[PDB]
């Protein structure tokens, strides 16, 4: 079914303003004026921020502002504070068959700027793993801000989309700003590609860690 | 048919106020919000004063006020002026079957003081008429104030409501404040009653004119 398109992450600095987008379809956001926005703190209850395009509920201050035009809604957080750091979800009525629909949410983080570029470090499969009949390539992406990261695996210059995962931010301060990415293969699949790369994309730039070929091309 | 009930005449003095009532039924005035009031001055087209209970149209003074409650509407003239002296008609939508209905109309008179006592004069049938086999009794009511005057005929203390009419006022001279009332009978019908009276009721007091009985007890 339809899921509303929201950018995964957004950021700003204290006392500044920031605006978040929620782009739907003609069958949801474009079809109705019933667009809501929720705020979600980790492990807690969702809180209503905006209803009916631009209207607030009681006990939310007048620096949160809503608006929409055509197939796209916007939330604008003016006068940024430290505590405004949360997940922001948009939702729409979407007719009887689908009923409700939600977005993919946006993580707003308050500090901003490309403060620290990631340090990437790669680890190849152990002797114990190869004997077991498995191969795990592990990539560690250390100490970086903004929190948003897009990480990709390339074997001999080809992108690998199979047998991978990367772990999400948690409560701990040092594991909020670090990411681990694990690629799992079999030994006679791992042997076929000489060179393994772990490349990351972040607001500041791109940073790529690899192991160079052991034969001449 | 439904004709909306309006008081015949109402009056006041400059800088004061006056309020006019228009009482209908539950199926007209009580049933709908489409109630209008018109102002009519002699020799000129009707003018909308109030529509939809209390709304004024463009360029009508902000001291004519409309209101309603249940089966009865009101027009209220605040800060009364000389030019406010006119006929005021009320009208209502009455539903699809009858469409519109109107009131009797109300004459507003600007003075509000009983300045002079009316002079009433009665006249027996003309000799020329009696020879013709007709009898006309004429009653003249001079110099009455402030507004309207109500006259009735009594023959030997019994009311006569047949074969009579009274002359409607007009702007010219003292014809606003003078009225004629003619009663027409036949001689062998007129001779039956001993005494003919012309009695009037007016704002200031009471005034009764008569011709005394031929035989006295």
């Amino acid at each position: 079914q339809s899921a509303l398109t929201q950018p995964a992450s957004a950021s700003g600095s204290p006392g500044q303003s920031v605006t978040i987008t929620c782009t739907g379809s003609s069958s949801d956001v474009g079809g109705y004026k019933y667009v809501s926005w929720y705020q979600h703190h980790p492990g807690k209850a969702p809180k209503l921020m905006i209803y009916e395009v631009s209207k607030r509920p009681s006990g939310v201050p007048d620096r949160f502002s809503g608006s929409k035009s055509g197939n796209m809604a916007s939330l604008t957080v003016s006068g940024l504070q430290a505590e405004d750091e949360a997940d922001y979800y948009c939702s729409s009525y979407a007719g009887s068959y689908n009923f409700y629909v939600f977005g993919n949410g946006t993580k707003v983080t308050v500090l901003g700027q490309p403060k620290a570029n990631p340090t990437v470090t790669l680890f190849p499969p152990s002797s114990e793993e190869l004997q077991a009949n498995k191969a795990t390539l592990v990539c560690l992406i250390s100490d970086f801000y903004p929190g948003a990261v897009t990480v990709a695996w390339k074997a001999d210059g080809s992108p690998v989309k199979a047998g991978v995962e990367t772990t999400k931010p948690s409560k701990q301060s040092n594991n909020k700003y670090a990411a681990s990415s694990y690629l799992s293969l079999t030994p006679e699949q791992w042997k076929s590609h000489r060179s393994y790369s772990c490349q990351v994309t972040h607001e500041g730039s791109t940073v790529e860690k690899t192991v160079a070929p052991t034969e001449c091309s | 048919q439904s004709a909306l009930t309006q008081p015949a005449s109402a009056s006041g003095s400059p800088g004061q106020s006056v309020t006019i009532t228009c009482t209908g039924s539950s199926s007209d005035v009580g049933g709908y919000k489409y109630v209008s009031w018109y102002q009519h001055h002699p020799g000129k087209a009707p003018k909308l004063m109030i529509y939809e209970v209390s709304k004024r149209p463009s360029g009508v003074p902000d001291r004519f006020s409309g209101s309603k409650s249940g089966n009865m509407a009101s027009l209220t003239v605040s800060g009364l002026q000389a030019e406010d002296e006119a006929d005021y008609y009320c009208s209502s939508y009455a539903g699809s079957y009858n469409f519109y209905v109107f009131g009797n109309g109300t004459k507003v008179t600007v003075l509000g003081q009983p300045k002079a006592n009316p002079t009433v004069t009665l006249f027996p049938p003309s000799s020329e008429e009696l020879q013709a086999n007709k009898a006309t009794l004429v009653c003249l009511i001079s110099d009455f104030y402030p507004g309207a005057v109500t006259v009735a005929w009594k023959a030997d203390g019994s009311p006569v409501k047949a074969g009579v009419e009274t002359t409607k006022p007009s702007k010219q001279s003292n014809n606003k404040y003078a009225a004629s009332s003619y009663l027409s009978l036949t001689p062998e019908q007129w001779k039956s009653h001993r005494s003919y009276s012309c009695q009037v009721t007016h704002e200031g007091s009471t005034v009764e004119k008569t011709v005394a009985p031929t035989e006295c007890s």
Binding site: - | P46, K47, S126, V138, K168, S173, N175
Partner: protein
Amino acid sequence: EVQLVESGGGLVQPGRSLRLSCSASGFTFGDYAMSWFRLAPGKGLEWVGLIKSRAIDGTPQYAASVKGRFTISRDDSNSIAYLQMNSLTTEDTAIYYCARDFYDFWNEFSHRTFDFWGQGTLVTVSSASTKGPSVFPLAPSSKSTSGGTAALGCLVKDYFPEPVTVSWNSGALTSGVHTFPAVLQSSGLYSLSSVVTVPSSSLGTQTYICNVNHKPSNTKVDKRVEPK
């Protein structure tokens, strides 16, 4: 801006047909409803009929009284409405007004309130056939019963068409005399009257006259003679 001018009125015999025109100006006529009202002298306003906008319907609606003998019509090309009246009764005597709906044709509150009233045209319906004015004296039954002053009068009846011109003592008095408004008395008797006030002691020895003139006929002269 909006102006409505009605024409076609006059004196008409009962049973005969008559067409009233209403010529509009200041608005685009074909998109608007038009309504007919009638004002009878001192009897208030009455609704006659209604014709809607051609964008919203366009078929005429009438009132009970005039149903199937009056007919409302339009010429949208020249901004002009008509009321055709067939088989007039004496109860159809009135000033007839043309009126515009207050609201625009797209509007929710359309066809519920009327404004922009014309000047109206008078329609009088009459079967009177009486010839010339009959003048009647109004004077005391016996001498010197009225105290300090006496009031004399001339009563004018039978005149048709309206009205008559009254003067006291050959036009010597336009001050101290009062001529009352014309009105219709029972069974076609159009009726007027005028008063003159004089001293009580003047009666008999001083002659007072009323002179009455009627344009489609001839003039009349009436004297007040001693009540012996």
